[PDB]
Design an enzyme around this catalytic site. Structure first.
Site, short mmCIF file in Angstrom:
data_model
loop_
_atom_site.label_atom_id
_atom_site.label_comp_id
_atom_site.label_asym_id
_atom_site.label_seq_id
_atom_site.Cartn_x
_atom_site.Cartn_y
_atom_site.Cartn_z
N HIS A 318 -37.34 5.82 -49.51
CA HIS A 318 -36.65 6.27 -48.25
C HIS A 318 -36.51 7.49 -48.08
O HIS A 318 -35.99 8.42 -48.72
CB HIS A 318 -35.42 5.41 -48.05
CG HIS A 318 -34.74 5.31 -47.05
ND1 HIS A 318 -35.00 4.63 -45.87
CD2 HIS A 318 -33.93 6.29 -46.19
CE1 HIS A 318 -34.45 4.64 -44.77
NE2 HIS A 318 -33.77 5.91 -44.78
N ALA A 319 -37.26 8.10 -46.87
CA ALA A 319 -37.30 9.37 -46.49
C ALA A 319 -35.80 10.06 -46.42
O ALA A 319 -34.93 9.54 -45.78
CB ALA A 319 -37.79 9.49 -45.10
N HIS A 348 -38.39 14.17 -37.66
CA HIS A 348 -36.92 13.82 -37.74
C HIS A 348 -36.08 14.39 -39.18
O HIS A 348 -35.12 15.05 -38.96
CB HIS A 348 -36.48 12.36 -38.19
CG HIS A 348 -35.22 11.85 -38.42
ND1 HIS A 348 -34.25 11.76 -37.55
CD2 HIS A 348 -34.67 11.76 -39.66
CE1 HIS A 348 -33.08 11.15 -38.11
NE2 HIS A 348 -33.38 11.35 -39.65
N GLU A 349 -36.91 14.35 -40.25
CA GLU A 349 -36.31 15.05 -41.65
C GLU A 349 -36.42 16.39 -41.42
O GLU A 349 -35.54 17.25 -42.01
CB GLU A 349 -37.38 14.51 -42.55
CG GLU A 349 -37.24 12.96 -43.06
CD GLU A 349 -36.16 12.27 -43.08
OE1 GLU A 349 -35.05 13.03 -43.79
OE2 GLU A 349 -35.81 11.01 -42.97
N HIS A 352 -33.17 17.86 -39.83
CA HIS A 352 -31.96 17.98 -40.99
C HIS A 352 -32.27 19.38 -41.64
O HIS A 352 -31.25 20.31 -41.79
CB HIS A 352 -32.04 17.11 -41.93
CG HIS A 352 -31.90 15.66 -41.65
ND1 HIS A 352 -30.58 15.34 -41.09
CD2 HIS A 352 -32.43 14.53 -41.67
CE1 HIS A 352 -30.41 14.27 -40.94
NE2 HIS A 352 -31.59 13.51 -41.25
N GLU A 376 -28.48 13.93 -37.29
CA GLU A 376 -29.45 12.98 -37.31
C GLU A 376 -30.21 13.04 -35.91
O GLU A 376 -31.36 12.60 -35.79
CB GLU A 376 -28.66 11.47 -37.20
CG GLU A 376 -28.08 11.07 -38.71
CD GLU A 376 -29.03 11.37 -39.84
OE1 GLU A 376 -30.17 11.11 -39.67
OE2 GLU A 376 -28.44 11.55 -41.01
N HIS A 478 -29.41 1.83 -46.42
CA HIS A 478 -28.27 2.40 -46.36
C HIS A 478 -27.10 1.58 -46.80
O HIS A 478 -26.03 2.26 -47.34
CB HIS A 478 -28.08 2.86 -44.97
CG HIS A 478 -28.93 3.77 -44.32
ND1 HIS A 478 -30.34 3.35 -44.11
CD2 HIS A 478 -28.91 4.91 -43.90
CE1 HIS A 478 -30.93 4.38 -43.73
NE2 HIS A 478 -30.13 5.52 -43.42
N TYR A 488 -25.74 7.20 -36.86
CA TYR A 488 -27.14 6.96 -36.19
C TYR A 488 -27.20 6.35 -34.86
O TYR A 488 -27.82 6.54 -33.85
CB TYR A 488 -28.08 5.93 -36.99
CG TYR A 488 -28.67 6.54 -38.29
CD1 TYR A 488 -29.80 7.34 -38.33
CD2 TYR A 488 -28.05 6.01 -39.61
CE1 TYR A 488 -30.08 8.24 -39.57
CE2 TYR A 488 -28.46 6.40 -40.60
CZ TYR A 488 -29.42 7.50 -40.74
OH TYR A 488 -29.92 8.10 -41.92
ZN LIG Z 1 -31.65 11.49 -40.85
#
Ligand SMILES: [Zn+2]
Ligand SMILES: *[C@@H]1O[C@H](CO)[C@@H](O[C@@H]2O[C@H](CO)[C@@H](O[C@@H]3O[C@H](CO[C@H]4O[C@H](CO)[C@@H](O)[C@H](O)[C@@H]4O)[C@@H](O)[C@H](O[C@H]4O[C@H](CO[C@@H]5O[C@H](CO)[C@@H](O)[C@H](O)[C@@H]5O)[C@@H](O)[C@H](O)[C@@H]4O)[C@@H]3O)[C@H](O)[C@H]2NC(C)=O)[C@H](O)[C@H]1NC(C)=O
Ligand SMILES: *[C@@H]1O[C@H](CO)[C@@H](O)[C@H](O)[C@H]1NC(C)=O
Ligand SMILES: *[C@@H]1O[C@H](CO)[C@@H](O)[C@H](O)[C@H]1NC(C)=O
Length: 595
Positions: A318-319, A348-349, A352, A376, A478, A488
């Site tokens: 999971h990323a 997305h990553e 962060h 997020e 999660h 999210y």
């Molecule tokens: Zn995220």
């Protein structure tokens, strides 16, 4: 008078906390990258050590009259240090919690199922094998097979561990004088009306979701037939192209408003042009730097894992993005694949990662998001731009595209299958966990309580009859990994506030200019949009989140106005199309969870 010594105390403690947390994070990284009994032991033992130190810190704060101070900054830092979370638990209870947590995360990561067509081949993992089938197969019985196999192994197998987790999570919250873990989580949003605010925004967007739901169900009936999909019932979830039915974009080719007109799917062109995970990350890096934001440091390239390892090892695929709390030691672990959706996930990553770099100069306690939703949202703002026909044409991934009225509706619908559909899903993840944390559901009713929410809010249901003999919630990463999910829902609302403002700043959106629609805005190359990001992200958690929003665009209120504005052209078209086609809206109560 005391504030002078307190400032010096905080300066030293923050640096100490960063260094101790670095050690914990390295062990957590090693475990997630390489799941073994030895790495599990190492991760948990170091965490126990840091927890013990945190206990001393919280105890030491009582020696400072911090609530009496003039400085809002000093008070805010001291308050952050009093919040122990799980570290408030007795030594033995904390060790047990850590053991249960790794039991659940490792179970999830280690799930393997047997091939539908070959009962001898039993090494199919969720990522990539099972997800490949769920996203691509249109054999409803094949889909149902993989759904059942996965949920049985990832969900039901950890019921007892999940029960003990809820107990210790509750005990921890109460030791911090929160009512439950629900209140402990909600404390991160620093707003005592936050739940009600989200109920209000959700209620405003709910009618649009119901129109999308109705239309998708109608289109699925034409594909699978009325034996598989009923007009009046909840949609069987295994037909929605995603294991958790959280986003429906994988079935866009069968539910798109105008099937004879272009539907953006650049995966094939990515493969044709010889894209690699390395190239995808380099392109993400390019997007940030094009906005005058921070380039990925050498440590990122040296230390990140951007492909699934080819040895026999177990790992969490999971990323995720990782901050190591030094200078420039930031990393991503992603089992990258060359797809359109994965290109968004890369961005997305990296969002962060950018946040980490932007606030790494802040004192340790401020080295986190303004609120969890802010963290997020960052990468998703760029992903919204990456997804536009405008941007995808620039990078040669979208060819011979004619952007007429019908193609626009297709693209808006495709976006809504990700952005609107997700809203009820995300809300239910925490509504469920909150209700268990708060002791509102008897243990005898825990599984059907999950599916009742999924029904009530999303109008989806399992492919087969479930009961209290099953336990399906932990089949979502999660939930097994004890990661709060409301972040999210907040993200999906506020990212449109950020997108709208960034687009206005970039000269890419004007509500009175037909040539500048919000849904085709590309913020690539915009220093002005980047400036707003720098202004907000560099703050970290130094100020309450409305101050961070204000730094971006002058607003202080979480609002559903922007997301509604983005989808308004779709709302108008869809309401009319559903009336034209006499499309049934709403659903009867599901029969798929037996009490
Ligand atoms: Zn995220
Ligand atoms: C979650 O909530 C919990 C309560 O529901 C809370 O637990 C309470 O924390 C209090 C500490 O803030 C603690 O108060 C102390 O009580 C001592 C005696 O308590 C015993 O007897 C009780 C029965 O009556 C038992 O139930 C307890 O278990 C104990 O065995 C007192 O001796 C103690 O006093 C001293 O400290 C105060 C400090 O207060 C300040 O002092 C400065 C001076 O520097 C002043 O300037 C300032 O104005 C302020 O008064 C001194 O005033 C005093 O002179 C003594 O030195 C103290 O009152 C309480 O016992 C404890 N439990 C309960 C049931 O109340 C948790 O702390 C909360 N948890 C979190 C994480 O927030
Ligand atoms: C995984 O961890 C084991 C010990 O737990 C270690 O010996 C091994 O080198 C690691 N494997 C990889 C591929 O890093
Ligand atoms: C790039 O960022 C710097 C500070 O980070 C700023 O001074 C400069 O104005 C930005 N470049 C442009 C073209 O705006």
């Amino acid at each position: 008078k005391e504030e002078i010594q307190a400032k010096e105390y905080l300066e030293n403690l923050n640096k100490e906390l960063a260094k101790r947390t670095n050690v914990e994070t390295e062990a957590a990284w090693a475990y997630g990258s390489n799941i073994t009994d030895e790495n599990e032991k190492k991760k948990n033992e170091i965490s126990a050590e840091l927890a013990k130190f945190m206990k001393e810190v919280a105890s030491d704060t009582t020696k400072f009259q911090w609530r009496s101070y003039q400085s809002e900054d000093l008070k805010r830092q001291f308050k952050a240090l009093t919040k122990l979370g799980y570290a408030a638990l007795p030594e033995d209870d904390y060790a047990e919690l850590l053991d249960t947590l790794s039991a659940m995360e490792s179970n999830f990561a280690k799930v393997k199922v047997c091939d539908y067509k070959d009962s001898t081949k039993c090494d199919l993992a969720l990522d990539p094998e099972i997800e490949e089938v769920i996203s691509k197969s249109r054999d409803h019985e094949e889909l149902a097979y993989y759904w059942r196999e996965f949920y049985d192994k990832a969900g039901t197998a950890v019921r007892s561990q999940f029960e003990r987790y809820v107990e210790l999570n509750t005990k921890a919250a109460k030791l911090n004088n929160f009512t439950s873990g629900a209140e402990a989580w909600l404390d991160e949003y620093e707003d005592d009306t936050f739940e009600q605010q989200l109920e209000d925004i959700f209620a405003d967007i709910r009618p649009l979701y119901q129109q999308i739901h109705g239309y998708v169900r109608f289109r699925l009936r034409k594909h699978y037939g009325d034996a598989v999909v009923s007009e009046t019932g909840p949609i069987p979830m295994h037909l929605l192209g995603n294991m958790w039915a959280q986003q429906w974009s994988e079935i866009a080719d069968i539910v798109s408003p105008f099937p004879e007109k272009p539907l953006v799917d650049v995966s094939a062109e990515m493969e044709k042009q010889g894209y690699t995970p390395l190239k995808m990350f380099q392109m993400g890096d390019d997007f940030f730097t094009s906005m005058n934001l921070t380039k990925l440091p050498q440590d990122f390239w040296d230390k990140s894992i951007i492909e699934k390892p080819t040895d026999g090892r177990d790992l969490v695929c999971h990323a995720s993005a990782w901050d190591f709390y030094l200078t420039d030691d930031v990393r991503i672990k992603q089992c990258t694949r060359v797809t359109q959706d994965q290109l968004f996930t890369v961005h997305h990553e990296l969002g962060h990662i950018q946040y980490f770099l932007q606030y790494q100069h802040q004192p340790f306690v401020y080295r986190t998001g303004a609120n969890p939703g802010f963290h997020e949202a960052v990468g998703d703002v760029l992903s919204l731009s990456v997804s536009t026909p405008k941007h995808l044409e620039k990078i040669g991934l979208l060819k011979d595209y004619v952007r007429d009225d019908e193609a626009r509706i297709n693209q808006l619908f495709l976006t809504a299958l990700d952005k609107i559909v997700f809203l009820p899903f995300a809300f239910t993840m925490d509504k469920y966990r909150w209700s268990l944390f708060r002791g509102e559901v008897d243990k005898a009713n825990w599984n059907c309580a999950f599916w009742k929410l999924r029904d009530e809010y999303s109008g989806i249901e399992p492919p087969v009859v479930r009961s209290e003999k099953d336990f399906d919630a932990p089949a979502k990463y999660h939930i097994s990994a004890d990661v709060e999910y409301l972040r999210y829902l907040v993200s999906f609302i506020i990212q449109f506030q950020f997108y709208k403002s960034a687009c206005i700043k970039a000269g890419q959106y004007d509500p009175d200019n037909v040539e500048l629609p919000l849904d085709n805005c590309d913020i690539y190359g915009s220093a002005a949009a980047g400036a707003a990001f720098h202004n907000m992200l560099s703050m970290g958690a130094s100020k309450p989140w409305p101050d961070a929003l204000e730094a971006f665009n002058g607003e202080r209120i979480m609002s559903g106005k922007a997301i509604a504005e983005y989808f308004e052209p779709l709302r108008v078209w869809l309401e009319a199309e559903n009336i034209k086609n006499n499309v049934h809206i709403g659903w009867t109560t599901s029969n798929k969870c037996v009490s």
